[PDB]
């Protein structure tokens, strides 16, 4: 029933060395072999370490596993970091013929430019209004790191209802995008003088406004 605990996120500059620890709650780590897996988003995992410290063919020698019996843990060590090493890393061991996975660690390779989001806000189309519906569309792109807060306003009053927002997702240029949708009746849209989309990122806010 033992668990394997690893940090949620580690980060390091390229060229340097990062360590990911894996600690088991019960028993001694040396009792069962430990594997490490790498998984990039949208891809299947790959084995990078097995049998504590063995390296499967194809895997760069910059990857190495070790065991620290005193702290009852295993470690994945990546020297000479490269951007391709950005992924999720999972440790794995055995508990009487049953496999146990760690929670995973997201490795962030530092060095990427911090960028503020570009915001485009669209009012409801004339056609949508004919169908007795209304949707405001807030398109948020080219921001880094991937974390934003979206707030909607009717005139100057906050709007919580009818708001659906996506998770940030990585673009092709390694920056992040997201979008937010405010649902209104055509009557609400015609009622107010304006609606606003406020996007906050790293303490700074970009606000776009549209009017009927």
């Amino acid at each position: 029933n033992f668990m394997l605990t690893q940090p949620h996120s580690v980060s390091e500059s390229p060229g340097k060395t990062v360590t990911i620890s894996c600690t088991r709650s019960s028993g001694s780590v040396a009792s069962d072999y430990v594997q490490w897996y790498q998984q990039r988003p949208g891809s299947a995992p790959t084995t990078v370490v097995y049998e504590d410290n063995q390296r499967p063919s194809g895997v760069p020698d910059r990857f190495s596993g070790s065991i620290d019996s005193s702290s009852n843990s295993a470690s994945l060590t990546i020297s000479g970091l490269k951007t391709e090493d950005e992924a999720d890393y999972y440790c794995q061991s055995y508990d009487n013929s049953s496999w146990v996975f760690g929670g995973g660690t997201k490795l962030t390779v530092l060095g990427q430019p911090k960028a503020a989001p570009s915001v485009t806000l669209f009012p409801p189309s004339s056609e949508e209004l004919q169908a007795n519906k209304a949707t405001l569309v807030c398109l948020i792109s080219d921001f880094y790191p991937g974390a934003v807060t979206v707030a909607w306003k009717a005139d100057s009053s906050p709007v919580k209802a009818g708001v659906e927002t996506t998770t940030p997702s990585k673009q092709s240029n390694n920056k992040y995008a997201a979008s937010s949708y405010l649902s209104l009746t055509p009557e609400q849209w015609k009622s107010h003088r304006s609606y606003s989309c406020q996007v906050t990122h790293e303490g700074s806010t970009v606000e776009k406004t549209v009017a009927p």
Binding site: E51, S97, S125
Partner: protein, 215 residues
Amino acid sequence: EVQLVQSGAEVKKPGESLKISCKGSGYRFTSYWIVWVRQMPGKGLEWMGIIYPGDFDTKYSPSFQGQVTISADKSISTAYLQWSSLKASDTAMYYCARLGGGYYYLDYWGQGTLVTVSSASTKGPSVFPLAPSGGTAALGCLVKDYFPEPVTVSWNSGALTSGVHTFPAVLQSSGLYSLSSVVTVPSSSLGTQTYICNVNHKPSNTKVDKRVEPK
């Protein structure tokens, strides 16, 4: 070349049974353990179980025991994962992997099978034009209230690719998806170049071509 090929993506409703597959080729299928792993959207890897096709020796993780059936058909080198009654929470990606090489490890992986389980029924999208700083204009279309994914969006029948940004969909509380695609164009090209978003939604046999023009 050793290879594990899994069956295609599945969209199902709760209560339905489902049997997904993992086909081995290029090796002695009965001689290697097959592992099944679950990965729910945005979460970690969970071990579901393992099977040795040679004698049907099968072990399940405690959290999956009695929830799912792992089996194998020797004569066609296929391992299976099956549910008698899908739950929405069974929505995940499922991987199979071969334990192989003197100590073995997961050396080959299937490409994964995405299982989406939802009470939503198939529905084509309503497409709305998003009508248009500097010599640059932004225009697009809103692809509203469809199920299931995916929708494919192109511009001018694939003729316009530069400056195109299609945003990943949102999943609304209604179980329906919505996305937007926006294209950035020279403002000088407005009214001299036609802009039409081609939205194809295969599951509902619906294709829409929406002309986008200034308000």
